[PDB]
C-alpha cells in the first residue's frame with residue numbers, strides 16, 4: 090500500500106526490475122519525467138554506487154551518470170583504478186524532479202523530498218538484494234540519508250567504512266560527495282574535493 094512497493098515484481102532479475110520500474114507511479118515524480126531511469130551494470134558487481142536522481146541528460150539517455158557529473162565521476166573512478174564496467178550504478182530516486190528557468194540552458198534538478206526517497210526505496214532494496222554488493226558508495230546527501238537516516242551528515246563521516254544493521258546483506262557503506270558538487274567553485278577547492286572523492290572510492294574498493 091506504500092510508495093513503490095506494489096510496483097516491484099517478485100524477481101531479482103535486473104532487466105525485469107527495470108521494465109517494471111518503467112510503470113511505477115509510486116510517487117508523483119513519474120508524471121513530468123520522460124521515463125524511469127533504472128540502475129546500470131550487472132549482478133556480479135562488487136561495488137554499488139547510488140546517486141540522488143537521474144538528471145537532465147540521464148532522463149533522456151535512460152542511463153545513470155551520463156552528464157557532466159557522470160564525466161567527472163568517470164575521471165575519479167579512473168584515478169582510483171576502478172573499472173566503471175564492473176560497478177552497478179543507480180540513484181535513490183528513479184525519476185528526474187526538475188524545473189526550467191526562462192533563458193536556461195538545461196532543466197534544473199530539484200531536491201527529492203524525504204517522502205519521495207522513502208517511496209522509491211523499494212527499488213533500491215530490490216537492487217541491493219539483486220546485486221548483493223560487498224560495498225555501497227553513497228554519492229551525496231540524498232543517497233546517504235536514504236540508507237543511513239535523515240539526520241546523517243556526509244560532511245562529518247568522510248573516509249569512514251560504515252555498517253548499519255537494517256541494510257539488506259550488511260554491505261559496507263561509504264558516504265561521499267556527489268560529483269555534481271565538484272563541477273563548480275574555486276580551483277583549489279575543486280582540486281582538494283576531487284582528491285577526497287578518489288580517496289573515498291579507494292576506501293570502497295579496498296573493502297574485503
Ligand code: SF4
Nearest residue numbers: 113115116183184209
Ligand atoms: S521516483 Fe521512484 S517511487 Fe516515484 S514514481 Fe519514480 S520510480 Fe516510482
